[model samples]
Target: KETAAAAFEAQHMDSSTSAASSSNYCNQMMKSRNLTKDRCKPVNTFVHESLADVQAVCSQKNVACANGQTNCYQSYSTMSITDCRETGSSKYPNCAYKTTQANKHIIVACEGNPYVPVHFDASV
Candidate 1:
């Protein structure tokens, strides 16, 4: 529950994000979200939408997990989300990332209540 809740919280954190945001959006967000501590997270994702909207994906559409798990679902709505990918300079201390924007369905691994996001599968 903690992981899912935290993940959801990261989506709407008290950070700044907009069409005007820079490529360093992840860097700013990572540092703000405490994702950059002893070491930086290699990759992370944040949805710029409401938690309720993300939860709805629990019963939206079924999809096969990349790991062959049968517990993945796709978001029904087109949402605003940030995809942070590890860059070449993404060393532990550096933790560089490339931020990308897209409007595609989300792929997440749901858990209890089955309405919660336990694992961030992917977005496409």
Candidate 2:
């Protein structure tokens, strides 16, 4: 039974720092309770909003963007609407509704360590 339980735990456990981090804590809790990660969405919730606000506050106290660029925002200048929509569907299905704002741009984080902000233009 212990071995089975451990195996189950391993399969269900969500170790993603980004997903389990404060921003996605509620979703994490839900996943824990339901044993289902599919229900979780990427949409920022109140808790996440508060966390981001607090982070910003602390950032002001410390050196802004001490890692590199101080004020980095995602640039959607080069991204096309189709690309953005596809990303939303494949990567963030929960946020697929954002495609309604076609012609607008959305920010995406840079790839790899020390990720920065990048933008994607919502076209189609």
Candidate 3:
């Protein structure tokens, strides 16, 4: 509902829409989301949970992020996610990706007054 969460969701959140069309999933999604316009994102993850559920992670107990940030929190429940990695053959304006789907506990960094997810830390 806040600015940071909205942007984070736009970049990293998606419903389960890649299982059937995963071959070209990263190519299409990366383009559509404007991630490939400038330079390819080497790696990314799409959480297949609702915005509400993802947002609620801000209320979980804070933990250290990979960067040692204490604002990060880990989800209590595991969720479906898609990992997109830029392919070796990828080129600008024609970004290619390999899709990997899995179920894992998500970690995210929160910020602002309402404390919404602003950065995706990792999954385990």
Runs off by more than 4 Å, candidate 1: 1-4, 11-20
- Residues forming the 10-long window of minimal summed lDDT in candidate 3: 15-24
Better of 1 and 3 by lDDT: 3
Clashing pairs in 1: none
Name every residue pair that clashes in candidate 2. 74-118, 75-118, 75-119, 76-119, 76-120, 81-123
**All predictions: root-mean-square deviation over Cα?**
2.7, 15.4, 2.4
- Per-residue lDDT of model 2, residues 14-116, tens digit only: 3332222333344344434442345433332111122232222222222223246444233323222211112234342232212111222223222222232
lDDT of 1: 0.73
TM-score of each candidate structure, all chains considered together: 0.82, 0.22, 0.89
The candidates, ranked best first by lDDT, are 3, 1, 2
Candidate 3 clashes: the total is 0
Q: Give the top-scoring candidate (lDDT).
A: 3
Ranking by TM-score: 3, 1, 2
Highest TM-score against the true fold, candidate: 3
Taking all chains together, the TM-score of candidate 1 against the true structure is: 0.82
lDDT of 3 at 8: 89
The C-alpha lDDT values of all candidates are 0.73, 0.28, 0.84
